[PDB]
Design a protein around this ligand. Structure first.
Ligand SMILES: CNc1ncnc2c1ncn2[C@@H]1O[C@H](CO)[C@@H](O)[C@H]1O
Length: 164
């Protein structure tokens, strides 16, 4: 049922993540880590320190779908086990240096055709599928976006709730 997910999403802030490739999402789904460019890294840190939950909703460029969503469990962290990211054209390993730890909540896909009725007030009320990497999604729009995803049987919400 939705009681457990709604408990996670309450008072959450939501950010769209746009990956240039599928490989780094595969990597991120397995290890439970993410990294973004310095502008979004600051914004996710600021949001982490201040919101009860910070939810990342992932979408691979040109895929036409979201691939899942995850909640930050830590702020940016530099100087650990180097992540073998597939680096898009024009990017340092150090640009993706602040590694966020994330707990995935859903790793299943949601096509854009199923989100078409949802628009984001914080992005001029365009459909929520429209946005750049890091675009923040108003509370209700992002809550509804996350409730559209199918239940993931590989995921147990228990560890997320125990650390919230
Ligand atoms: C591991 N982290 C990442 N992996 C793949 N693409 C990313 C990414 N972080 C940002 N991007 C995207 O790649 C573009 C190149 O800067 C950005 O505008 C984002 O849309």
């Amino acid at each position: 049922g939705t009681s457990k997910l709604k408990y996670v999403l309450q008072d959450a802030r939501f950010f769209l993540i746009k990956s240039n490739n599928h490989e780094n999402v595969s990597l991120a789904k397995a290890k439970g880590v993410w990294a973004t460019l310095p502008v979004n890294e600051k914004k996710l840190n600021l949001a982490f320190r201040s919101a009860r939950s910070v939810i990342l909703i992932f979408s691979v460029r040109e895929s036409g779908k979201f691939q899942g969503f995850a909640r930050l469990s830590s702020e940016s962290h530099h100087g650990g086990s180097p992540i073998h990211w597939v680096l898009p054209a024009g990017m340092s390993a150090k640009m993706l240096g602040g590694v966020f730890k994330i707990d995935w909540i859903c790793r299943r896909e949601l096509p854009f055709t199923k989100s078409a009725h949802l628009t984001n007030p914080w992005n001029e009320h365009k459909p929520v599928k429209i946005g750049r990497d890091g675009q923040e999604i108003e509370l209700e729009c992002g809550t509804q976006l996350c409730l559209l995803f199918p239940p993931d049987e590989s995921i147990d919400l228990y560890q997320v709730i125990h650390k919230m």
